Design a binder for these strands. Structure first.
Lengths: 257, 204, 120
RNA sequence: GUAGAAACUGCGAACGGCUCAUUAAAACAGUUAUAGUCUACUUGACAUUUAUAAGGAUAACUACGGAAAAGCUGUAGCUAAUACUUGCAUUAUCCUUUUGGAUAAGUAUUUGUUAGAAGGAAUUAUAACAAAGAAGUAACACGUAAAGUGUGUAUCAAUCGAGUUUCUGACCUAUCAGCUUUUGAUGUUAGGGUAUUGGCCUAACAUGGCUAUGACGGGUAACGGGGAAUUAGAGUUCGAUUCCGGAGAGGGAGCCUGAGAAAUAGCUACCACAUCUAAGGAAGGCAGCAGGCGCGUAAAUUACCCAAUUCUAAAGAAGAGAGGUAGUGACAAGAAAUA
């Protein structure tokens, strides 16, 4: 037959998964869920190859059996569960909270997060639908459906979704001064203020983003994520703060120690 | 030749082994389900009537009720056909089968007695075996004993000491499940109403 | 004999009730020291009253001798060892005995046992 | 309470593995579309026209049997189920104006008449009226804060995918120059069919469509690509073979179940082979892993294990010739004795 493929070859795995060639012939195919396979990482990899808590898949299963790891404050027990771009995974045993982010290089890194920030996740809206009764519902990057959004929320906006109540608290627009983070581009993981946008009739829309050091980089509209206004980010960025350094000064300031 | 006679009322059966062709001649050209006077087999069988209900041909190929021939045929077998066991879902197979008309080919016959005669047969109508296992549904127990909804029927289950458990009970956990569903629906409607109200209030 | 322990990337793992680390045993001009000695060595290092809560694996003596790298785990207790660790490792440690070694004969027997061919 | 053979039920077996025969604008690759569609598991939302809980019927099993033989099964008797099947409040709207009165009640899908947050553009979302209208909304099982979960279910959305689809890109050959068009060739109209668009098919109609910028043929010892050898730069040759896509399971065709197959360690038939037979009849598909014969210049063990990687399940705990380990191994590659 020709049904859905259910295996993932090790070399065919996404690059940011960052697995070794000789470490077996297969990679864990993420179960279908809230995030795309390419745009996410299974929690098996998250806490075997990143947190190093478990050194085999079986120990990953042993961890997951105890309802101790919660993705967005709800217990998850699927080994190949897609965690996705930004969300709060809380481990109760060590009482630690990680918000998943990108880095300037473009891999998925857990970021240590305090309790007050761990109940406060960001969701980039992707679609605005209206169902029966003229009730509007937002489809977010998280694969989440939020009914009864404010009318002022637009298609590309980003809402602060509270983890417990699942309700939006406030939304951020996509003006030319809005802080943004690139999610899949050549400049994945970069953070900037959106210098400008341009609308292409019937084709991809490009936006040019200004860095902290006045560095302009362009990207497609489909893979940007508003993370705040001009004032400041609404989350805590990793140690590079989303500032991608050039290949020269990166070596230069790595050398000095 | 090996007439397997069954009394379903007593749930008991007897194997009669015969060889003479004139003895079973009256059964010739009688399709399945036919009632035939079971007289010529022997003196004791005089009086009873037998319902022809199955058989197996000389090569062991069983009989059916559909194909009304006197020999073997092959045909496709469905999932719900009564002479075939599928190995996987939706699998169909073509197998030989022997027609319902009975002739001088059957290596075995299966018959049931329908009408009592005048004699008695040892072990065929003397003793009887009951259900051999009681019903499990509470409705079945309630119908068998006729005690309506007066009291729990778990005290009036038949023994093996050890009793099978009864389905479709009136357990307090069942009642709790129903009330939990009710209150879940209620609070869901309540949160719907308040969230509609807050949407209306934030519209302006 | 005289040797020294060196423990690297030591991190607590409450999720498995373990603490994970890598061990290099420096024994210059001396052969490889068996696992028992390093066992009570780190037992007194971490003030452990019991030694069977130790699992040691992946000991490589390196080129030229005098060093040996490896991995070790402590456990909260024997119950944690039994719960969170594989049976081949338990057998290697010696706290349980090996199971029946029929192997793939089970597979061939299970294929011989075709459903409703053996009434039992 | 703990378990629990068998069996019914559920899920999977459509993944994986192997091979490269077919295939020359086909497949494939980059680039699009799906405003022309389907989509199990998983994830998020969320529902409409006897009840202190409804019905029969069956496996396992019991006993009587047949056949040389097989994943063969006949008759009689019971019983279960999350197998199969029936079936029980409420909400919203208008008026005096917290409150009292008054009014209305089908999810997809289909038809007809209208109004009309987003897209690039709507016959869009949605809404109104008139007709139909599936399937459902728990007659189900275990227990978490010093009320939860599992299983199942309508619709939408996401996700894992898929089918079609735009543009562009291929080796030799003209001792292949005109092809296609009754028998669909090119297009229109209407319909049928499909998950959807489409000559995909049917009917009517028109005479179109491609071609020296090589059509149509022929050849390929041709699966395509990522890639490999050789390279100063150009180039030339190779790519069965780690990954991706395609195709196939001796050759054809047909079909059931299923979300997904024109499946082949699923079925049906024919052709070619070929096994057992008491001669009546049964049963088969190593281009899966080993291994054998044959062919050849030309290629390994009828080994061990699920410990790692990962998949399936009723999902720690079972399986997995996937895969890993070792054996044979002067295919290649690296270091390096004979002082």
């Amino acid at each position: 037959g020709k049904g859905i493929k259910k295996h993932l070859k090790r070399v065919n795995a996404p690059s940011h998964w960052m697995l070794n060639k000789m470490g077996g012939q297969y990679a864990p195919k993420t179960s279908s869920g809230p995030h795309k396979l390419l745009e996410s990482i299974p929690l098996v990899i998250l806490l075997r190859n990143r947190l190093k808590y478990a050194l085999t898949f079986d120990e990953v299963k042993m961890i997951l059996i105890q309802k101790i790891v919660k993705v967005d404050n709800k217990v998850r027990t699927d080994c190949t569960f897609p965690v996705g771009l930004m969300d709060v995974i809380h481990i109760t045993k060590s009482n630690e909270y990680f918000r998943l982010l990108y880095d300037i290089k473009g891999r998925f890194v857990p970021h240590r997060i305090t309790n007050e920030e761990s109940k406060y996740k960001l969701c980039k809206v992707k679609k605005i639908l209206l169902r029966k009764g003229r009730l509007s519902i937002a489809v977010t990057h998280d694969g989440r459906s939020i009914p009864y959004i404010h009318p002022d929320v637009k298609v590309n906006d980003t809402v602060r979704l509270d983890l417990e109540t699942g309700k939006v608290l406030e939304h951020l627009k996509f003006q030319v001064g809005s802080l943004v983070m690139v999610t899949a581009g050549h400049s994945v993981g970069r953070v900037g203020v959106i210098s400008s946008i341009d609308k292409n009739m019937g084709t991809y829309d490009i936006i040019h983003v200004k860095d902290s050091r006045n560095k302009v980089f362009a990207t497609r509209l489909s893979n940007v994520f508003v993370i705040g206004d001009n004032t400041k980010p609404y989350i805590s960025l990793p140690r590079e703060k989303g500032i991608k350094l050039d290949i020269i000064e990166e070596r230069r300031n790595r050398l000095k120690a | 030749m090996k007439l397997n006679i069954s009394n379903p009322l007593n749930n008991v059966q007897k194997s009669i082994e015969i060889d003479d062709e004139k003895k079973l001649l009256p059964f010739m050209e009688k399709r399945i389900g036919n009632a035939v006077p079971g007289d010529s087999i022997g003196e004791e069988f005089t009086g009873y009537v037998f319902r022809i209900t199955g058989g197996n041909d000389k090569q062991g190929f069983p009989m059916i009720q559909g194909v009304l021939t006197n020999n073997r045929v092959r045909l496709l077998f469905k999932k719900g056909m009564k002479c075939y066991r599928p190995r996987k879902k939706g699998e169909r197979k073509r197998k030989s089968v022997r027609g319902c008309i009975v002739g001088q080919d059957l290596s075995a016959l299966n018959l049931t007695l329908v009408k009592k005669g005048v004699n008695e047969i040892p072990g065929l109508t003397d003793k009887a075996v009951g259900k051999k296992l009681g019903p499990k549904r509470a409705s079945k127990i309630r119908k068998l004993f006729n005690l309506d909804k007066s009291d729990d029927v778990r005290k009036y289950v038949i023994g093996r000491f050890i009793k099978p458990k009864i389905q479709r009970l009136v357990t307090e956990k069942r009642l709790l499940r129903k009330r939990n569903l009710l209150q879940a629906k209620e609070k869901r409607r309540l949160e719907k109403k308040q969230q509609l109200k807050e949407y209306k209030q934030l519209l302006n | 004999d005289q040797f020294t322990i060196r423990v690297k990337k030591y991190m607590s793992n409450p999720l498995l009730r373990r603490k994970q680390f890598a061990l290099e045993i420096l024994h210059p001009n001396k052969g490889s020291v068996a696992k028992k000695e390093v066992k009570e060595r780190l037992a007194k290092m971490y003030k452990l009253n019991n030694v069977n809560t130790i699992v040691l694996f992946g000991f490589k003596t390196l080129f030229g001798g005098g060093r040996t790298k490896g991995f070790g785990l402590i456990y909260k207790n024997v119950d944690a060892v039994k719960k969170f660790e594989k049976k081949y490792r338990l057998v290697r440690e010696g706290l349980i005995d090996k199971e029946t070694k029929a192997g793939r004969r089970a597979s061939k027997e299970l294929k011989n046992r075709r459903k409703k061919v053996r009434g039992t």
